[PDB]
Design a binder for this molecule. Structure first.
Ligand SMILES: Nc1nc2c(ncn2[C@@H]2O[C@H](COP(=O)(O)OP(=O)(O)NP(=O)(O)O)[C@@H](O)[C@H]2O)c(=O)[nH]1
Ligand SMILES: NCC(=O)NC1CCN(Cc2c[nH]c3ccccc23)CC1
Ligand SMILES: [Mg+2]
Lengths: 166, 468, 166
């Protein structure tokens, strides 16, 4: 069966890591251990075709900024995450996309823009601005919740469809 | 068995139930509990658990304030003695002296072990986590008064000890089996710091002095910079400055390697530069500097450099193999790296990034409390996972390298500044443009460029010499 | 990799802590700070194999003599230390060996007899006398200095070889 290598990218300090964790973690209990083998591997059924997800999430390593090229080059598809209560992370999305395009040497890499709600602070990025940014890049936009797991399957499954339809 | 004081006058005498403590499934391992029960187990009368003490003092600040911890162990320390028993009453009523067998047993088997273990918590607190006291003078005053007013000669030795330790820490030499190797020089001779550069210093001595530099930076990172995922928060410059110094040095080196390559426009000279950097990588492997290995690999995999097909075509076959092995260390989520690290003989310099991701994901992936029977227990198995990681870190910080520092080469590398006054985005674009100027996209023809280096480009090799 | 639980025992002041810190950190501690119970870890390569050493440094002061059974139960091998300028500490060694044998209910417990402070001239226990004792226990005798690092690796690594061949 096919293995997709997805890479999550985006600003640190705003709950990016919730995405992969909520995806993988036995989302009906919580005893999570990132240490163990294949707590980043996940067999799933997307549109009836079984496939294996390989998620690289290097959250915490954001200051190793010269390592991004190496990490990005490993992936077939990209999840670009910002926090909806952090405008800076939204504005950084552009540089992440230009960097991805450059290490893949391509102008259409499969990617998804993901707006992540990581707490109960006030939204400062409206859906509309995000849709518009996503439309200008020609990529899907998806919002997720770091508490309720809402939108997390949609985000990854959408990215796989984006890869399959490339 | 043995009788405890009343739970009304000594809170740490409450019986264990699933409403205050939960064990995992040869001493027990605690999965969750109340602060009271955690502190009781931290200082249990039956057994000591030194790995539990390290775990608690590393991670407690996420569920309990320092002032409140001190109040709780001061409370645990003042154990009420039992009243005289019937056999003691009857002896006294005949003017005899009591045996006091149960009071003597309670002192020897409960009070004395619980009080030493409380003192041991204090000792570890002051000796390995003194920053609680640096950031709070009142907390230190209370600790000194608590320790300074402990009466009883069974405790006397450790009380005098901890007093002296606290006083030293307030104002605040290595032995090797072998002698360190001779410092190696190439084209730049000792003292001629203006000539120092990637090709003029000896590649062996570059790897050595960078290894010493990075080992010092690695050894300086304390667990206070990690717990609470604080290196990722807004105040990370306050809370994590030794961690951030290390990461930024690693980033500088990587960018310095990238810059050395793409600013060498002549293809023959660039192949010499790339080849020398791979020779430095080889000595990193030798010295177990995995941080240096990944600096070099990150430079080779960067955008400006990875695309230089003409340069890598002319690299000696044996060095494609060295670079390809080093790159495989990072594949499959660092599978082979983790294996290599857990098999070498230290000293080494680990790669810090893996630990960072594991600590952060552990803190975001696990609830800070567990709800059981309408009670909120502290989830302690989450804190043990984090302290497991910080304990691995600290283990690789003990062993020093047997290498001589060369001050001038150290100063040169400390002061490296590839970006200069430019921002990261400008400098990153500069490197990539240089890459397109010196090896254009297909099908544009490959230009020629004049040499910039006057001195010989022949590598002196990475096998050490040894005069008498 | 295999993990080994070593325990360092002996009278107070003989150098148990100084030996362990010398082994672990290549550093000699000049202050005399009475131990209650300290723990250390060391990854090391012995006879071509990689192992994790879990070293427990114990209290030698008589005040803590009722708290030994708990650590003697867990330890896999014991480093029995005395100081060569201290006859009383050598006489106390008999008592540690006896207590270990009892607690572990075995006559074949891996241990090594260590005679510390061999960097000093003023010696009051003779090698012959210590060696005679070691042979009657059927264990090796090694003289060490925590100050000059003499014999330190030899003692800990010898003990590890014995746990291996148990
Ligand atoms: N000259 C010399 N002094 C030593 C040596 N080993 C230890 N000492 C000194 O002896 C004193 C006691 O050392 P220490 O390690 O604290 O002994 P200990 O066995 O751990 N005692 P305790 O059981 O109370 O923890 C210290 O002053 C230390 O510097 C040695 O090999 N040579
Ligand atoms: N087959 C098309 C191609 O370009 N193959 C290689 C040619 C040269 N090259 C070697 C290389 C450059 N930077 C690296 C970093 C790590 C491992 C290998 C390399 C990488 C790709
Ligand atoms: Mg000691």
């Amino acid at each position: 069966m096919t293995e997709y290598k997805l890479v999550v990218v985006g600003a640190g300090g705003v709950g990016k890591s919730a995405l992969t964790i909520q995806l993988i973690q036995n989302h009906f209990v919580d005893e999570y251990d990132p240490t163990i083998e294949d707590s980043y591997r996940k067999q799933v059924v997307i549109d009836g075709e079984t496939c294996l997800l390989d998620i690289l999430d290097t959250a915490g390593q954001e200051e190793y900024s010269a390592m991004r090229d190496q990490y990005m080059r490993t992936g077939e598809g990209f999840l670009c995450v910002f926090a909806i209560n952090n405008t800076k992370s939204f504005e950084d999305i552009h540089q992440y996309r230009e960097q991805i395009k450059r290490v893949k040497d391509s102008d259409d890499v499969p990617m998804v823009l993901v707006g992540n709600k990581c707490d109960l602070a006030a939204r400062t990025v409206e859906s509309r601005q995000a849709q518009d940014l996503a439309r200008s890049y020609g990529i899907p936009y998806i919002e997720t919740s770091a508490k309720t797991r809402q939108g997390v399957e949609d985000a990854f499954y959408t990215l796989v469809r984006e890869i399959r339809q490339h | 068995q043995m009788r405890l004081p009343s739970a009304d006058v000594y809170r740490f005498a409450e019986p264990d139930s699933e409403e205050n403590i939960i064990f995992e499934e040869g001493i027990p391992i605690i999965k969750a509990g109340t602060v009271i029960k955690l502190i009781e187990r931290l200082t249990y009368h039956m057994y000591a658990d030194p790995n539990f003490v390290r775990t608690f003092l590393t991670t407690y600040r996420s569920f309990c304030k320092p002032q409140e911890l001190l109040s709780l162990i001061i409370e645990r320390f003042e154990i009420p003695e039992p009243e005289p028993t019937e056999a003691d009453r009857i002896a006294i009523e005949n003017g005899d002296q009591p045996l006091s067998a149960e009071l003597k047993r309670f002192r020897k088997e409960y009070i004395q072990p619980v009080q030493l273990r409380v003192l041991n918590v204090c000792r570890h607190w002051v000796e390995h986590h003194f920053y609680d006291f640096e950031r709070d003078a009142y907390l230190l005053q209370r600790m000194e008064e608590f320790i300074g007013t402990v009466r009883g000669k069974a405790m006397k030795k450790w009380v005098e000890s901890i007093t002296k330790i606290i006083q030293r820490k307030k104002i605040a030499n290595i032995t090797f089996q072998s002698s360190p190797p001779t410092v190696e020089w190439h084209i730049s001779r000792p003292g001629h710091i203006e000539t120092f550069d990637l090709l003029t210093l000896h590649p062996i001595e570059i790897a050595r002095q960078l290894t010493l530099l990075e080992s010092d930076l690695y050894r300086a990172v304390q667990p206070s910079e990690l717990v609470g995922s604080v290196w990722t928060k807004e105040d990370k410059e306050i809370n994590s400055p030794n961690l951030l110094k290390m990461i930024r040095h690693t980033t500088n080196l990587t960018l310095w390697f990238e810059k050395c390559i793409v600013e060498t426009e002549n293809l023959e000279e660039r192949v010499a530069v790339v080849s020398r950097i791979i020779e430095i990588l080889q000595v990193f492997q030798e010295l177990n500097n995995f941080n240096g290995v990944l600096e070099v690999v990150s430079a080779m995999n960067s955008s400006p450099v990875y695309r230089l097909d003409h340069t890598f075509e002319q690299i000696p076959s044996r060095q494609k193999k060295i670079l390809e092995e080093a790159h495989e260390l990072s594949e499959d989520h660092y599978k082979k790296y983790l294996a290599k690290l857990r098999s070498i003989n230290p000293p080494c310099v680990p790669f810090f990034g893996i630990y960072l991701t594991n600590i952060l994901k552990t803190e975001e992936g696990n609830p800070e409390v567990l709800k059981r029977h309408g009670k909120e227990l502290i989830n302690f198995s989450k804190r043990r996972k984090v302290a497991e990681i910080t304990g691995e870190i600290q283990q690789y910080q003990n062993q020093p390298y047997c290498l001589r520092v060369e001050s001038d080469i150290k100063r040169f590398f400390e002061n490296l500044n590839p970006m200069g006054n430019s921002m990261e985005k400008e400098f990153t674009d500069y490197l990539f443009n240089k890459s397109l100027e010196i090896e254009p996209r297909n099908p544009k023809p490959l230009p020629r460029f004049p040499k910039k280096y006057s001195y010989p480009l022949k590598s002196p090799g990475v096998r050490p010499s040894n005069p008498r």
